[PDB]
Design an enzyme around this catalytic site. Sequence first.
Site, PDB file in Angstrom:
ATOM      1  N   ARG A  81      12.110   9.931 -12.374  1.00 14.40           N
ATOM      2  CA  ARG A  81      13.335   9.439 -11.773  1.00 14.40           C
ATOM      3  C   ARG A  81      13.756   8.102 -12.399  1.00 14.40           C
ATOM      4  O   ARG A  81      14.905   7.918 -12.796  1.00 14.40           O
ATOM      5  CB  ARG A  81      13.115   9.276 -10.270  1.00 14.40           C
ATOM      6  CG  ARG A  81      11.746   8.675  -9.915  1.00 14.40           C
ATOM      7  CD  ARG A  81      11.748   8.006  -8.547  1.00 14.40           C
ATOM      8  NE  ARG A  81      11.315   8.921  -7.498  1.00 14.40           N
ATOM      9  CZ  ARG A  81      10.053   9.047  -7.092  1.00 14.40           C
ATOM     10  NH1 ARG A  81       9.097   8.303  -7.648  1.00 14.40           N
ATOM     11  NH2 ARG A  81       9.749   9.914  -6.128  1.00 14.40           N
ATOM     12  N   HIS A 112      -3.087   8.863  -1.754  1.00 16.24           N
ATOM     13  CA  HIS A 112      -1.885   8.043  -1.724  1.00 16.24           C
ATOM     14  C   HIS A 112      -1.884   7.192  -0.471  1.00 16.24           C
ATOM     15  O   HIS A 112      -2.253   7.656   0.602  1.00 16.24           O
ATOM     16  CB  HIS A 112      -0.642   8.913  -1.764  1.00 16.24           C
ATOM     17  CG  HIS A 112      -0.147   9.216  -3.144  1.00 16.24           C
ATOM     18  ND1 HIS A 112      -0.009  10.507  -3.618  1.00 16.24           N
ATOM     19  CD2 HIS A 112       0.295   8.401  -4.132  1.00 16.24           C
ATOM     20  CE1 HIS A 112       0.484  10.470  -4.844  1.00 16.24           C
ATOM     21  NE2 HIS A 112       0.679   9.206  -5.178  1.00 16.24           N
TER      22      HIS A 112
END
Lengths: 205, 202, 205, 202
Positions: free
Chosen positions: B89, B166
């Site tokens: 991105r 994460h």
Amino acid sequence: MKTILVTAFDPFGGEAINPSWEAIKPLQGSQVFGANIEICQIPCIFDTSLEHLYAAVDKYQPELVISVGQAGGRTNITVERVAININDARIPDNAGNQPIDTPVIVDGPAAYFSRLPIKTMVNALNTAGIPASVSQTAGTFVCNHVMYGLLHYLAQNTPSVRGGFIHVPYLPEQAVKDGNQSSMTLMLMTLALKIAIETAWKNTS
Amino acid sequence: KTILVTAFDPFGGEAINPSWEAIKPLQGSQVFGANIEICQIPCIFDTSLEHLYAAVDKYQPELVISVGQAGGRTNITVERVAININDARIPDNAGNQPIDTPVIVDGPAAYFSRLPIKTMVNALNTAGIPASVSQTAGTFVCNHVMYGLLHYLAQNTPSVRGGFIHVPYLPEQAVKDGNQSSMTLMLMTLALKIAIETAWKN
Amino acid sequence: KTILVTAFDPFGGEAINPSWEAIKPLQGSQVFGANIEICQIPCIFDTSLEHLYAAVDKYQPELVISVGQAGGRTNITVERVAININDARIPDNAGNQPIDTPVIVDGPAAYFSRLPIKTMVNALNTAGIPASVSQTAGTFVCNHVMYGLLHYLAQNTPSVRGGFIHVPYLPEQAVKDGNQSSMTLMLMTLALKIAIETAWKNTSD
Amino acid sequence: KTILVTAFDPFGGEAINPSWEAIKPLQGSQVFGANIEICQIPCIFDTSLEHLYAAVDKYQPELVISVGQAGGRTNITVERVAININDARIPDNAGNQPIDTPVIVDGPAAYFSRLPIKTMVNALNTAGIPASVSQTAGTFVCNHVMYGLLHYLAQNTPSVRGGFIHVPYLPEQAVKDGNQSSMTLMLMTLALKIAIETAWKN
Ligand SMILES: [Cl-]
Ligand SMILES: [Cl-]
Ligand SMILES: [Cl-]
Ligand SMILES: [Cl-]
């Protein structure tokens, strides 16, 4: 001496604890810029809640009153802007009441704005590195019911006294159940409330 | 015995990376028979792998767990699968913004984590820490490093188990975004301790 | 010249499956000299692959696209990868609830979709339809099928491209589920058609 | 015998306003021996009220429903309460950005909608349209207008019921904003027609 009164609820049925209570417990008897903080726990029941509240405001005659509740799902500490004259309950309260679209106080005004310095509180929190925001709805359960009662009672009896509401999110242990739900540790919560209450005290506007 | 735990430096913007902050306290501590080593790796494509490969080579770990940050997630997530694709991105700290290129050319499409992910997620939930299994590590630098890790273990040392955790935002980073979930540094550090000890034990 | 498009029969709860409802209008439709053939397959582990393998053999298609429902998603999603794992939170239409088991033993960990996914998401976005590439097809029957599909094509008919598309809830579905994103059947059918044309066009030379 | 129904013009950035696009087909449509009049009003603080007050004076409505866009919401929402506050994140079409000023000085803190909000939500849900009651109409121009509407009605024609409905993004709009809920124009128009029919009948 000057007194700041802080309230919270007992566990709501399912839960074994109420975080809001747990979070303010460490504040008991502490001093902030020349006012001592008093705490008091109220039942999570319509109308019975206000009775308990009124008794507390009556006994302590506080210069500032701040009620705290839990808003499961919200990501951050939220300071309420407005309380609405309406009970509308998704589930029943602790005593089995589930009112549908009935007034908190009959013939009372539609709403009361919190008198607290809300933007400064949110500002103080953000600066301290704690996520926080102003909310325009306290809901229509017991939390909003108590906020409306508080603001009305202060307006009828002691109008110089400032009142307001703060919602804390889920504790991590609670978000485990729900699953994908935001939380905040007990410790941070207690710190956020402390910062908010000092900030409420110092200022007014 | 050695447990290698890795994290990233900050994504250009931020001044810190929570993941590095969270595992710093772990260095040197002993877990059953093993000692934890930490090592921070740059947040940029392909260089990241090199630093990683270096660290695995130096420490020769029985167990390797990489940690990264997943802003927006509500809870600790343990990764299931790493995917052989870079698709970015934004650019990494060095300006690379790969689109739909392989992490490793002619590498398999994916690797499964070798860790006991469900057990880890259970240990965390039981301990009152929100956690869940995730089926996507993203396609940015974290997945890049995850796929790279598991492929290196698979080539050079197949008995060694690797995987990825994460962590969400720290509270201070969620002020910036606004309405974004967070978790305090303390809680992360505890979650990672529990998570790592569980992986070792199993 | 045939394009096979599959969807599921309703999952136990639901009275219909939208993915099926959405592709029904496409049965027999021409696209650039190809014909759309639709086929409904059971929402059951393993039996579904059997129906799917049967349909591929029967219709011998040059392009296969499978469609499913992803309650919760806001938009149209084109799946990037199928994972070799079954992990069921609830059971399938036949009572099976497999926990961490291969879709196909000794198959590769995953399969990338062979479809032109970015071009499909772009064709959709350009036509005003919200869409995006998805990195996970879940681990229920939908991913199970996507994986089996790619495996089967790889092994028997390697030049034939396969892929999966997820649609969101229909509005009637979102009423029950309360606060859930939906998309009308009409938009869904339109999206699938544009997706399929785009796929067929970028599967040429 | 007239139902006045209002919507806003596109907001600065936007090219259209879904609230307007969805009530256009309703113009002059009859519902139970009443006729629907529509009117677009500016997305500017105060100026909007002047337009609104004028439309009420001209059309002399028996029912007034104002419609607005609430980008991000998943369903049709029927507002319960209007709040006497302007607090703007961004500025209105004419550069105005009031911070914490009253909508109307010395007015009551709120007005409840006089619409049968639960019945409307039920008819919508029954008809398979996602919908729900909302306790905040925001503090931008939509809430501003709601409050002004209900206050004006209460001071000039207290027999007349008023209220506000919010619609989500069109799919066109959610393409930009990416991961955003939408509802097609057709389903909006349908929803609005059912809500108004219900509100009038009750
Ligand atoms: Cl509470
Ligand atoms: Cl990271
Ligand atoms: Cl499905
Ligand atoms: Cl609007």
